[PDB]
């Protein structure tokens, strides 16, 4: 519930060096409340991360350790009459199969013991029913930076800002290898883009992509809220707020300032 | 100047007359990123080639269908493109083109079309009225055909209904075209549809082989899935990736990132761009014009003039002014006189002088000109304050006045301008 | 349509003889349209002298070659022929290779391509 | 069109009474020396130097 | 620089020469200013080459030849004080003309003034 | 649409330089001050009260 | 405007048949504008065929359509035909009774209102 | 050429091709009778503020 400063990314692929911009597109207001939906194979039952509306898109930020969280799915409906979008992680794949899948399905455990030596892709979450219209994708290196975290003083805060304008899909990954507090520190990193994707259609409803099969350490929660607990995803939502990002010579964005937060901000 | 200045004489003093602006010799196309993709021979160079009752749908996508290579693919071919003509379509790029490919007869090369008839028109492949895309059609005798007897390819002989536009259909249950039903047995009133093609050597033009690709887009919200140059220092119209504009396209060294493309400034101008092809950062600026003023020493003294291209380095693009580059023209001062570059432009037709005098025409950065004889002629001086003097200060010297001087000096000052009173009425509406 | 038409044959016949030219497509082609031969006489226009459908089922014969001429395609080669017979005095004319553009023939002049000369004599 | 020529027309009147209004202010302050002059360097004598 | 807009502000008249005149005026007098405040001496006086005068110690407002600028070390901590893009300006027609006077020249006329005061009291100022 | 866009253009530079002008003239009362103050104050002494 | 049109007929015709099409209008508008067809040739643009002034004063015909298309306005029930004499068998289009929304048609490019597209193909 | 003014005689020399007499103004300080090639002076209206 305290995005104190993350969330920023880079609005465009535009090089400043040293300037003091103004943006006016859709940000994470700062010192917003991030849901904690923190999330719990024992069962098909007892459904641990339920939908949310992906309203002017939202920013997710996750601390799993190397497989928990794999993907996301996104649509309208996650049904056969709409359009279903796949950015699952693979081990080295992040096809982005926007077939329209019949149904979303859920990790099919093939027992109740789930992770002792498996590790090949088999069996999997299957939640692509097989489907008719399976578009384009952008197989490629995993966005999802699987990283091989260590050394302690660590936790990837895979902050991903997803965003559709005009139709076009933008992603926005900065994984932080550096120490966090508790869960968000009072830092500053900007998003960089990762994958420009065009697939023009609705995207209205989004959800996580639990693809476990592990039941591999995740807490239990059981309320819907706003605050900063440990979090299989934190979601936030991107608002019409401007900015005022400044620019090293590098053009890193160092800093920035949100324009409405407070009056010294403004 | 005597028609900016609206005057047959002019006199001593520099007047600003026009402006000098460089053009653009050249212009760079620069957008490739160098990137190709796309193979087409999964779609034309495949040996096997599915049937018509069996045509496939590969949509070619995010990679380029670069139709040079496809232009000339066989011997003859019907390139019977549709909504436009192929050549024009080349640099036509279109969102989701959907390549269809099969093969059909030769004969039935005329029922192969939008909204045809027949057992292969109606009852294989119906193309809609409103049909978009090309449709590619070769012979593969040597490929299709087998001098044996090619009755392992097949064309279908009857089906029930025409397709719905770009529709698929294999169905290939007995048909029955009386009362007594099949009972799951061929024989009366049952019919197969698929017909085996008549593929011989001996076979005439009509029934010979020839496959048909039908390539259609449907221009959506997608990527056109479906051209450079090179450039130096000289100031030409640059587009790299479709940034549009003109400038300087001089070697750049500040550190991009790698997604940064279009580098900016403080001001909306594209202060740089990185190379796409090259991935090096290329530095823009603006092409050197400035304003162009004329060091007149007065009509009445003599025609003899010199000019000031203001705020240019021409050390560079004026003093390699070649014919007819420099805007007030006479080309005959390429070289000129002698050209001095300044802090404020540089003069030509101008030589400058170790030796400073009073300023009499003002040019800037403390340069003056004048016109003093050597032999009139224009020179550029250095301004000069004053005569330099020293005064013998001393702990015990004075020194003190034994006679004065009675100067009685004008002073001049304006206190009333004319007056003056408007009417709109009588101004605005006569 | 960038159809590629190559010319050959001529020389020199008796009244009475024979011949064979051959003409053919290739490059790319707006649709299969339909080959033909004309005749333009030094002076004269290009007149309809044999139309054939591509396919070897459709074919013309004009009053003069009735008879006379014959028109036929090969079936290995992608050529199609062109024979003449009985040739009086007047028929000393310009033969260019023709091409029909078009689907079916309409009239004798709408074209799209045209071939070069050939000067055909008639000698014992 | 006459509305078209009327903004013109107006704005060409409009920018010579501020070009004057600049320029009067310039000459008031020429005005205000010259009157200042008088009083001191005719009326009087001045110490004030040069 | 389009030919087909080009032509229409032609049929506005002088409403643009008026401009390149109006800002001419300013460019001009700001030339005056300048020569007014400091060319108000006609010769150049240079101190003596000893600078005892009598026990006022002025090095820190005399010029310093130790500087490769001739200025002194007031005036150079005034310069390095004030912060004075450019171009920017230069690519749209905004180009922004020199002074007529130098850095050099402006700081070469106060040493006049500055020397004169010091080895002429105000005399030099009503005549020789 | 280019008169629309000339016009909004050609005003935002009449104000600039009618912007100018009264700033030029602030200027010149300052370099009129500057240059009494260099006449009185310095090439001689002043009687004048602060 | 809101402007509702009723268009209907059509058929099967053949090389050298012809049309008496129809198409009613109701709905208030903002003037007095023009009835009319535009016909995209199947797979081509929308191009206008034949206008008729609503006071029937002016008549329009173009070269595609000359001597094969003429359009008047029913002075019974307001339903403005498209009758035709010898239509040729290149005309297997759908056409659209569209509706300028204008008393004069400077440019046909703008079409306020338009219709609905009657699908004729034109075989024996 | 349509306007309004005091139709005076006019002392001038219209060389004869010069019909629009004119001054260094829009004013057509000059005419010339389209059908007499008598040149008459023009004066506009004796009007003033009150
Ligand atoms: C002060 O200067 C004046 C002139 O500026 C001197 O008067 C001149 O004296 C000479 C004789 O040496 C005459 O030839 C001139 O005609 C005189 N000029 C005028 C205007 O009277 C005067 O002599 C000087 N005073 C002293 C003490 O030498
Ligand atoms: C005049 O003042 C300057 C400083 O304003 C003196 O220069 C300093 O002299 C001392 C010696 O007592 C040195 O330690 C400093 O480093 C000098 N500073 C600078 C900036 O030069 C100078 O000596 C004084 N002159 C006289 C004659 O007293
Ligand atoms: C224009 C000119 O001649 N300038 C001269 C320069 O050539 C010479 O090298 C220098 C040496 O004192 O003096 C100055
Ligand atoms: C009044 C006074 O102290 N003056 C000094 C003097 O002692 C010294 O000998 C001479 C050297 O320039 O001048 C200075
Ligand atoms: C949101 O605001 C505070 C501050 O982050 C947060 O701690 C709290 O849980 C939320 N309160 C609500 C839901 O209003
Ligand atoms: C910024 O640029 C400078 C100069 O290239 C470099 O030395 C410095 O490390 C950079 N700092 C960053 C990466 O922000
Ligand atoms: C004009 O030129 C004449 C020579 O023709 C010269 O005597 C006169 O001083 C000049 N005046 C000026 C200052 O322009
Ligand atoms: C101007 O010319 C070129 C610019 O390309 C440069 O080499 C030269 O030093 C410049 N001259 C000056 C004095 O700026």
Redesign the interface.
């Not at chain 1, 465009?12 to 060096?17: P, T």
């Given at each position: 519930t305290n995005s104190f400063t993350r969330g920023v990314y880079?609005p465009?692929?535009?090089?400043?060096?040293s300037?003091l911009h103004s943006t006016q597109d859709l940000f994470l207001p700062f010192f917003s409340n991030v849901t904690w939906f923190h999330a719990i194979t024992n069962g098909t039952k007892r459904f641990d991360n339920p939908v949310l509306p992906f309203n002017d898109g939202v920013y997710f930020a996750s601390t799993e350790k190397s497989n928990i969280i794999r993907g996301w799915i996104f649509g309208t409906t996650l049904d056969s009459k709409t359009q279903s979008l796949l950015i699952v992680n693979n081990a080295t794949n992040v096809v982005i199969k926007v077939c329209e899948f019949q149904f979303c399905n859920d990790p099919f455990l093939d027992v109740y013991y789930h992770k002792n030596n498996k590790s090949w892709m088999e069996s999997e979450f299957r939640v692509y029913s097989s489907a008719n219209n399976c578009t384009?994708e952008?197989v490629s290196q995993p966005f999802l930076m699987d990283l091989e975290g260590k050394q302690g003083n660590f936790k990837n805060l895979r902050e991903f800002v997803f965003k559709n304008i005009d139709?076009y899909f933008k992603i926005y990954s900065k994984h932080t290898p550096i120490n966090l507090g508790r869960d968000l520190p009072q830092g500053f990193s900007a998003l960089?883009?990762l994958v420009d994707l065009?697939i023009?259609i609705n995207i209205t409803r989004f959800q996580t992509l639990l693809a476990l099969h592990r039941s591999y350490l995740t807490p239990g929660d059981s309320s819907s809220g706003w605050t900063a607990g440990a979090a299989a995803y934190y979601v936030g939502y991107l608002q019409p707020r401007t900015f005022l990002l400044k620019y090293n010579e590098?053009?890193?964005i160092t800093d920035a300032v949100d324009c409405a937060l407070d009056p010294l901000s403004e | 100047t005597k028609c900016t200045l609206k005057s047959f004489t002019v006199e001593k003093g520099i007047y600003q007359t026009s402006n000098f602006r460089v053009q653009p010799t050249e212009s760079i196309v620069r957008f490739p990123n160098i990137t190709n993709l796309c193979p087409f021979d999964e779609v034309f160079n495949a040996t096997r080639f599915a049937s018509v009752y069996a045509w496939n749908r590969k949509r070619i996508s995010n990679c380029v269908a670069d139709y040079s290579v496809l232009y000339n693919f066989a011997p003859f071919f019907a390139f019977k493109c549709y909504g436009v003509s192929p050549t024009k379509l080349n640099d036509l790029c279109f969102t989701n083109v959907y390549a269809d490919s099969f093969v059909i007869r030769g004969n039935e090369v005329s029922q192969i079309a939008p909204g045809q008839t027949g057992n292969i028109a109606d009852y294989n492949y119906k193309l809609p009225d409103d049909f978009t895309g090309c449709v590619i059609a070769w012979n593969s005798n040597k490929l299709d055909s087998k001098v044996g007897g090619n009755y392992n390819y097949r064309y279908r002989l009857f089906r029930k209904s025409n397709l719905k536009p770009f529709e698929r259909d294999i169905s290939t249950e007995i048909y029955q075209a009386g009362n007594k039903p099949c009972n799951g047995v061929a024989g009366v009133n049952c019919y197969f549809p698929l017909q085996s093609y008549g593929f011989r050597p001996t076979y005439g033009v009509g029934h010979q082989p020839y496959r048909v690709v039908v390539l259609s887009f449907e221009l959506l919200h997608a990527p056109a899935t479906v051209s450079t140059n090179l450039v130096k220092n000289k100031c030409v119209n640059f587009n790299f990736n479709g940034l549009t504009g003109t400038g300087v396209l001089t070697e750049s060294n500040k550190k991009f990132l790698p997604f940064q493309q279009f580098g900016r400034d403080i001001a909306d101008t594209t202060d740089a761009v990185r190379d796409p092809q090259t991935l090096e950062i290329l530095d823009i600026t603006p092409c050197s014009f400035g304003g162009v003023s004329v060091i007149t020493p007065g009509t009445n003294t003599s025609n003899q003039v010199a000019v000031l291209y203001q705020g240019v380095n021409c050390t560079e693009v004026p003093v390699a002014i070649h014919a007819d580059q420099l805007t007030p023209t006479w080309r005959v001062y390429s070289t000129g006189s002698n050209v001095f570059q300044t802090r404020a432009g540089c003069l030509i037709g101008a030589e400058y002088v170790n030796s400073s005098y009073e300023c009499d025409i003002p040019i800037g950065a403390g340069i003056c000109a004048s016109y003093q004889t050597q032999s009139q002629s224009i020179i550029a001086y250095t301004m000069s304050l004053g005569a330099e003097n020293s005064v013998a200060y001393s702990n015990n010297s004075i020194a003190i006045p034994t006679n004065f001087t009675i100067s009685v000096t004008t002073e001049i000052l304006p206190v009333s301008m004319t007056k003056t009173s408007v009417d709109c009425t009588m101004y605005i509406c006569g | 349509s960038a159809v590629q038409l190559q010319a050959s044959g001529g020389g020199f016949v008796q009244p009475g003889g024979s011949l064979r030219l051959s003409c053919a497509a290739s490059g790319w082609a707006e649709t299969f349209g339909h080959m033909g031969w004309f005749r333009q006489a030094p002076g004269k226009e290009r007149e309809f002298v044999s139309a054939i459908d591509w396919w070897d089922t459709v074919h013309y014969y004009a009053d003069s070659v009735k008879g006379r001429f014959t028109i036929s395609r090969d079936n290995s080669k992608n050529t199609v022929y062109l024979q003449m017979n009985s040739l009086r005095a007047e028929d000393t004319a310009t033969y260019y290779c023709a091409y029909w553009d078009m689907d079916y023939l309409q009239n004798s002049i709408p074209v799209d391509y045209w071939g070069q000369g050939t000067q055909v004599t008639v000698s014992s | 069109q006459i509305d078209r020529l009327i903004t013109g027309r107006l704005q060409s009147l409009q920018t010579y009474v501020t070009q004057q209004l600049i320029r009067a202010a310039e000459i008031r302050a020429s005005a205000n020396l010259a009157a200042t002059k008088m009083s001191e360097c005719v009326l009087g004598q001045s110490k004030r130097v040069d | 620089d389009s030919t087909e807009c080009s032509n229409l502000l032609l049929q506005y008249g002088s409403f643009c020469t008026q401009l390149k005149r109006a800002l001419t005026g300013i460019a001009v007098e700001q030339d005056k200013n300048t020569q007014e405040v400091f060319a108000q001496v006609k010769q150049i006086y240079k101190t003596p080459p000893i600078k005892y005068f009598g026990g006022f110690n002025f090095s820190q407002i005399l010029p310093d030849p130790s500087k490769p600028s001739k200025r002194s070390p007031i005036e150079d901590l005034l310069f390095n004080k004030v912060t004075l893009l450019i171009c920017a300006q230069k690519f749209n027609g905004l180009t922004v003309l020199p002074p007529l006077l130098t850095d050099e020249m402006i700081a070469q006329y106060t040493s006049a003034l500055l020397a004169g005061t010091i080895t002429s009291g105000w005399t030099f100022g009503a005549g020789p």
């Open positions: 880079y465009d692929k535009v090089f400043r060096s300037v384009f952008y139709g960089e883009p065009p023009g590098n053009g890193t | - | - | - | -």
